Amino acid sequence: ASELTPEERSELKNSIAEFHTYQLDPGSCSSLHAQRIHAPPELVWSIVRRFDKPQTYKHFIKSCSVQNFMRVGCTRDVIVISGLPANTSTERLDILDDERRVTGFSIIGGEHRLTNYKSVTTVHRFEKENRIWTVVLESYVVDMPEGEDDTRMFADTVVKLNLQKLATVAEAMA
Amino acid sequence: MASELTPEERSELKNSIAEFHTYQLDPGSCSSLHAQRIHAPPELVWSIVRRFDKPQTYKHFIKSCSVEQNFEMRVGCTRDVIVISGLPANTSTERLDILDDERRVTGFSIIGGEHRLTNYKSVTTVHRFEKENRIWTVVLESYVVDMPEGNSEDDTRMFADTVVKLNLQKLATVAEAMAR
Amino acid sequence: MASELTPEERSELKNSIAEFHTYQLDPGSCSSLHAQRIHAPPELVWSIVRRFDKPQTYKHFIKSCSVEQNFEMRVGCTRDVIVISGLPANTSTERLDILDDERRVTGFSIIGGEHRLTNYKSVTTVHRFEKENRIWTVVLESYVVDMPDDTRMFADTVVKLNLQKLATVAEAMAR
Amino acid sequence: MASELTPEERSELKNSIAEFHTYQLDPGSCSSLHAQRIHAPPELVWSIVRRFDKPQTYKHFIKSCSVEQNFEMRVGCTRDVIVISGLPANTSTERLDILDDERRVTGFSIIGGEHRLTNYKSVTTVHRFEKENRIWTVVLESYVVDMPEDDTRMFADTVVKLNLQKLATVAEAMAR
Ligand SMILES: CC1=CC(=O)CC(C)(C)[C@@]1(O)/C=C/C(C)=C\C(=O)O
Ligand SMILES: CC1=CC(=O)CC(C)(C)[C@@]1(O)/C=C/C(C)=C\C(=O)O
């Protein structure tokens, strides 16, 4: 399910080059994750695109606040409860292309400020012999740790798990 | 749907729920119960669940686990759990409270480790279902914890619920894969 | 990160990062980029860096490195690196991917051995800086590996320490 | 050069070397001694080195370390060291063998955890140098491990040197 076929990988190469390839600052790193979803890509995109409702697919979110709300440069506050004194994160919508199904955001303030976290998600339609399905790609770039508590392992784990929830939610909707 | 019991499942499980997963709460404490359907034999699921020395086999977030040398699994034995960074705690020392191989019940209590969970105690029970010719499992897990001094700090329950739910999902994925 | 690169250094390195240190990732992999400033001439640093047969000069945890007898360095050649960071010493077979003496770029892939499954590939570049008559060096080293048991924090740590050893060595030599 | 003693340093240190860093080795065991010059006051260096509960302050490769709650630092106390992945161990439990604040000497033995370093015992001594009206520190650290051997010795030597290098860096940053 996170393991793409060679057919899928060839089809995704141009999108990876375009949206998921970062020019790194020294002291940073990037990861790319994939998730196959047995649902139509318009349905998956309808969930993914909702900047105000990350809790639908992401774990560890208490709440998300944005009022009479969606545009590039919009911000959200995500209260997360993966920290037990609940933490707030301020995130900005960097990209939103409904025709090409691309969105992304950056963490611009709050507890994980020093991470310079930036992420992009793309949604992709596959069709083989009357069967239609979806692949989601999600990549991020983050600063590497300077100063004991590196959370990049946790960042990868959570993306993986989040994408797994997205597949579950979307497949149950379909 | 994997985490939501059918009426037939919850009818059959009433007595188990009353015996192991029903709590009369003190002030400053919270509990919750989670269910997880697994398409695998209960004896296989139980063989994973009972391994007190290997929680990493079915739990996320565990870097490693150590137990005493010449480990004999008996109630009262402890394990030292090492978690990955990014979480409210990086270690947990846990005590085996119950190990009943006949009835398929375990449970543990968090004794120590630096974290925000105080007096956490959980119980896991494993249940056989058979219909027509098919066999499947339901796992129930409940916990009680002390909630912090923020009054109804729903943060603690929200955090533990997520972890427990994710760990039950992994248990299902692991047992199912093993069944194949 | 030697300590941190200046805005001027970063600006000057943009083009090299784009050319040599940006990877088109496979799903399930990650890439990381480290820098080290070195107060020594670039030709000196490169003379150490380019020696595929002698990684032990700048890298940690190497028991030995062996190559072909009468070694002639060119792309496609391999080395066996016995590493001691595992206590039942492990061996790594690594392939020289790039060598450009004119532009000071080299890189290798792990093709066999204990961490063969990681699909590790790394690139090192050496850069000359001159401002107001002092001359110095920045080294960039990047890698890509599959994500898994997760030894990638060790991989970043060891790259950082290795670059620190390169700086210490080259700076001593320049004296 | 910082890991390399001068003849004047080693001559003064002959006494300390003989007392703490010289070994009568049972077969199947090996020992090694390392040195690190630190341009910082020995009291600062000792204040870091003596902190049995905080080895991450000067050691590489440590994810975390815990000591029993309400810990008081005395010979016989233990710590549980958690190490990042990629190395021969996940964990190490270590016992404080020596803690002499007057003479600036500690040491510890590994008594458990899963790795390949059985009966590892090390001793660390911190030394003052003055000559003349200019002050620096030399740290000596030696260990005895029994092997399953160049490999065991090469590994431990690597860690010890790296850790001494960090100690020097961290101390020198604090002195600034
Ligand atoms: C993953 C993690 C993070 C923490 O902050 C607390 C603790 C370390 C105990 C924990 O292991 C939590 C474990 C829980 C809730 C349940 C379990 O294990 O059945
Ligand atoms: C870094 C590491 C890797 C291991 O495999 C063993 C162990 C966990 C003991 C260790 O902490 C080793 C520590 C050593 C040699 C010395 C020290 O700490 O003074």
Swiss-Prot record, chain B:
Keyword Transmembrane on entry: no
Binding annotation for abscisate: 59, 89-94, 116-122, 141
Gene Ontology CC terms: cytoplasm; cytosol; nucleus; plant-type vacuole membrane; plasma membrane; protein phosphatase inhibitor complex
Record-marked site positions (Involved in interactions with PP2Cs): 88, 152
Region spans: START-like: 23-176
Role played: Receptor for abscisic acid (ABA) required for ABA-mediated responses such as stomatal closure and germination inhibition. Inhibits the activity of group-A protein phosphatases type 2C (PP2Cs) when activated by ABA. Can be activated by both (-)-ABA and (+)-ABA. Promotes drought tolerance.
Name by which UniProt lists this protein: Abscisic acid receptor PYR1
Gene field: PYR1
